[PDB]
Design an enzyme around this catalytic site. Structure first.
Site, mmCIF file in Angstrom:
data_model
loop_
_atom_site.group_PDB
_atom_site.id
_atom_site.type_symbol
_atom_site.label_atom_id
_atom_site.label_comp_id
_atom_site.label_asym_id
_atom_site.label_seq_id
_atom_site.Cartn_x
_atom_site.Cartn_y
_atom_site.Cartn_z
ATOM 1 N N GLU A 5 75.511 25.029 21.742
ATOM 2 C CA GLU A 5 76.390 24.578 21.021
ATOM 3 C C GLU A 5 77.123 25.864 20.223
ATOM 4 O OE1 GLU A 5 75.961 20.195 20.069
ATOM 5 O OE2 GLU A 5 75.726 19.787 21.143
ATOM 6 N N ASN A 11 74.628 25.888 26.441
ATOM 7 C CA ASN A 11 74.787 24.476 27.063
ATOM 8 C C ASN A 11 75.587 24.085 25.884
ATOM 9 O OD1 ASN A 11 74.272 22.755 27.992
ATOM 10 N ND2 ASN A 11 73.483 21.670 26.384
ATOM 11 N N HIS A 29 79.044 13.701 28.463
ATOM 12 C CA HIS A 29 79.117 13.220 27.119
ATOM 13 C C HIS A 29 80.364 13.167 27.610
ATOM 14 C CE1 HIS A 29 75.198 13.390 25.709
ATOM 15 N NE2 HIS A 29 74.865 14.182 25.694
ATOM 16 N N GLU A 42 73.335 16.549 30.012
ATOM 17 C CA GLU A 42 74.015 15.100 29.581
ATOM 18 C C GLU A 42 74.471 14.316 30.035
ATOM 19 O OE1 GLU A 42 73.873 16.648 25.265
ATOM 20 O OE2 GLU A 42 72.052 18.110 26.179
ATOM 21 N N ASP A 89 76.789 11.275 30.711
ATOM 22 C CA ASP A 89 76.665 9.956 30.437
ATOM 23 C C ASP A 89 78.605 9.911 30.639
ATOM 24 O OD1 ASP A 89 77.542 10.941 27.856
ATOM 25 O OD2 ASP A 89 75.427 9.636 27.159
#
Ligand SMILES: *[C@@H]1O[C@H](CO)[C@@H](O[C@@H]2O[C@H](CO)[C@@H](O[C@@H]3O[C@H](CO[C@H]4O[C@H](CO[C@H]5O[C@H](CO)[C@@H](O)[C@H](O)[C@@H]5O[C@H]5O[C@H](CO)[C@@H](O)[C@H](O)[C@@H]5O)[C@@H](O)[C@H](O[C@H]5O[C@H](CO)[C@@H](O)[C@H](O)[C@@H]5O[C@H]5O[C@H](CO)[C@@H](O)[C@H](O)[C@@H]5O)[C@@H]4O)[C@@H](O)[C@H](O[C@H]4O[C@H](CO)[C@@H](O)[C@H](O)[C@@H]4O)[C@@H]3O)[C@H](O)[C@H]2NC(C)=O)[C@H](O)[C@H]1NC(C)=O
Ligand SMILES: *[C@@H]1O[C@H](CO)[C@@H](O[C@@H]2O[C@H](CO)[C@@H](O[C@@H]3O[C@H](CO[C@H]4O[C@H](CO[C@H]5O[C@H](CO)[C@@H](O)[C@H](O)[C@@H]5O)[C@@H](O)[C@H](O[C@H]5O[C@H](CO)[C@@H](O)[C@H](O)[C@@H]5O)[C@@H]4O)[C@@H](O)[C@H](O[C@H]4O[C@H](CO)[C@@H](O)[C@H](O)[C@@H]4O[C@H]4O[C@H](CO)[C@@H](O)[C@H](O)[C@@H]4O)[C@@H]3O)[C@H](O)[C@H]2NC(C)=O)[C@H](O)[C@H]1NC(C)=O
Ligand SMILES: *[C@@H]1O[C@H](CO)[C@@H](O[C@@H]2O[C@H](CO)[C@@H](O[C@@H]3O[C@H](CO)[C@@H](O)[C@H](O[C@H]4O[C@H](CO)[C@@H](O)[C@H](O)[C@@H]4O)[C@@H]3O)[C@H](O)[C@H]2NC(C)=O)[C@H](O)[C@H]1NC(C)=O
Ligand SMILES: *[C@@H]1O[C@H](CO)[C@@H](O)[C@H](O)[C@H]1NC(C)=O
Ligand SMILES: [Mg+2]
Length: 318
Positions: A132, A173, A208, A236, A238
């Site tokens: 990030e 990432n 996400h 990651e 979801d």
């Protein structure tokens, strides 16, 4: 073959964020570890390799938590991703007041000591070195390293990671970089440079997502990172919705998981795997971060698969 996620995904891995407290809860909740072994063949430590946990005071390292996840992974011959080394969050308080060369020295020591430990003890397939590092408008995030060292900290961190001489792929990432936008443009320019300079191997896309609201050009964006010569991974995943879940959202969630799988498969050998950020909804970070939202993973509170489970299997096989 072909009833599980791990079987359907081959030769790609299908992984999960694994938290130490859930792994050690095998007595009271055996289905967490059982579902991990039967369905998944990749793992990412949810928290315990992050700086606040792994170096809680300066030059005092605590590998216990990371070692537990790595050992579970090793026992099951998982693909293990180290996560993460440089990130503005979950950072030990003592780092944030360091300035200039002193900050950089602490950072070099963090990266080197952690990577050397896991080089000697386990098989780490890939490291998320920097996480990030950008803002949504495509500027550099002004965290402590940017403020004290300028934008060069990013390639320098990968330079340090390279000098450990591990056989690990080095990843960068981020989130909100999955579509084509200012943030992914900025990331791409930096990745193209770092790749040219032999500093980075992979790009991680967190993914996400909110149901029915995925980025419009997901596959096309993956494709231009692959054209830059890096491998990619969904790191990651979801896909959350408002609770209680409507039938329409449950069905759309299935389509959304398939959309992500198809965007990965479209890249062929360059997309190496998909990781969901957890196994069951019961422990997902979402309902505690976004009240009234959840149902975002592939298994529900009772470890019964979502309809998205079937859609994911089918997309992986097709
Ligand atoms: C380096 O990095 C390391 C890794 O991260 C760090 O180590 C971790 O540190 C964290 C933070 O401190 C720690 O997490 C906390 O752990 C607390 C301790 O919990 C454990 O022990 C208690 C007490 O056990 C004793 O008593 C019971 C019976 O009463 C007995 O069975 C035990 O054997 C033991 O007895 C012995 O000692 C007593 C005296 O204490 C003697 O009288 C006796 O004779 C014996 O000699 C247990 O109750 C806990 O057990 C739970 O969890 C285990 C899983 O490990 C289950 O098997 C067990 O059944 C039970 O599960 C139940 O509780 C959990 C939550 O704990 C529920 O989820 C579950 O549903 C069950 O109901 C542990 O064994 C713990 O108290 C604390 O709890 C937190 O949450 C509660 C909410 O309940 C809050 O109120 C608290 O404020 C806490 O926030 C928390 O979990 C990790 O355990 C620890 N290790 C690891 C591997 O992660 C390390 O610190 C770091 N080092 C540095 C930085 O220097
Ligand atoms: C290790 O494994 C154990 C399992 O053995 C794990 O424990 C379990 O952990 C989960 C996850 O945290 C808990 O689920 C949550 O439960 C609460 C409600 O909990 C209360 O009610 C329970 C039901 O009680 C009735 O039924 C039982 C029998 O079924 C009867 O015995 C009762 O008398 C009642 O009639 C009750 O069982 C709970 O247990 C409590 O008991 C002990 C004493 O025994 C107490 O001291 C403890 O406090 C303990 O809690 C408790 O009384 C639900 O509210 C949660 O649902 C929310 O969150 C979900 C995701 O987590 C989400 O899917 C839901 O939709 C819902 O989310 C919504 O609402 C939120 C409100 O907070 C919003 O914030 C959110 O945004 C959204 O809108 C959740 O289902 C289990 O209760 C718990 N089970 C046990 C037995 O403890 C443990 O966590 C594991 N540990 C680790 C580290 O992995
Ligand atoms: C694009 O979006 C980004 C993110 O929203 C935005 O960046 C932000 O810019 C402002 C300034 O325009 C930053 O605000 C601060 O300004 C003071 C000086 O008054 C600095 O001291 C701040 O440094 C940080 O570090 C301090 C410790 O020394 C801390 O107190 C604190 O963390 C400070 O933020 C900082 O420069 C702001 O921090 C950034 N935000 C981020 C996340 O980078 C930018 O303006 C936008 N650009 C556009 C729209 O063109
Ligand atoms: C980000 O978008 C703005 C539009 O508000 C544009 O002016 C700017 O050039 C973009 N930034 C980058 C780095 O492309
Ligand atoms: Mg192995």
């Amino acid at each position: 073959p072909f009833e599980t996620l791990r079987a359907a995904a081959a030769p790609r891995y299908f992984g999960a964020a694994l938290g130490v407290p859930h792994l050690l809860n095998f007595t009271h909740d055996p289905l967490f570890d059982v579902t991990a072994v039967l369905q998944f063949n990749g793992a990412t430590p949810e928290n315990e390799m992050k700086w606040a946990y792994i170096e809680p005071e300066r030059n005092q390292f605590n590998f216990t938590g990371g070692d537990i996840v790595a050992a579970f992974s090793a026992a099951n011959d998982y693909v293990l991703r180290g996560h993460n080394l440089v990130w503005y969050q979950e950072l030990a308080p003592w780092v944030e007041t360091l300035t200039g060369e002193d900050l950089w020295n602490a950072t070099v020591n963090h990266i080197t000591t952690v990577m050397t430990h896991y080089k000697e003890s386990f098989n780490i397939y890939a490291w998320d070195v920097v996480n990030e590092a950008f803002n949504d408008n495509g500027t550099y995030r002004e965290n402590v390293w940017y403020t004290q060292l300028g934008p060069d900290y990013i390639p320098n961190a990968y330079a340090v990671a390279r000098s450990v001489n591990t056989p690990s792929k080095l990843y960068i990432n981020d989130y909100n970089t999955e579509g084509i936008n200012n943030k992914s443009d900025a990331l791409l320019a930096v990745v193209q440079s770092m790749k040219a300079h032999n500093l980075v191997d992979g790009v991680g896309f967190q993914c996400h997502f909110f149901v029915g609201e995925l980025p419009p050009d997901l596959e096309q964006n993956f494709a231009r990172f692959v054209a830059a010569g890096v491998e990619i991974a969904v790191t990651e995943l979801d896909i959350r919705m408002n609770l209680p879940p409507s039938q329409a959202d449950i069905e759309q969630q299935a389509r959304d998981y398939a959309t992500v799988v198809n965007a990965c498969k479209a890249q062929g050998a360059a997309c190496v795997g998909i990781t969901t950020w957890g196994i069951t909804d019961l422990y997902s970070w979402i309902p505690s971060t976004y009240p009234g939202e959840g149902y975002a993973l592939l298994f529900d509170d009772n470890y019964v698969p979502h309809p998205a489970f079937n859609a994911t299997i089918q997309a992986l096989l097709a």
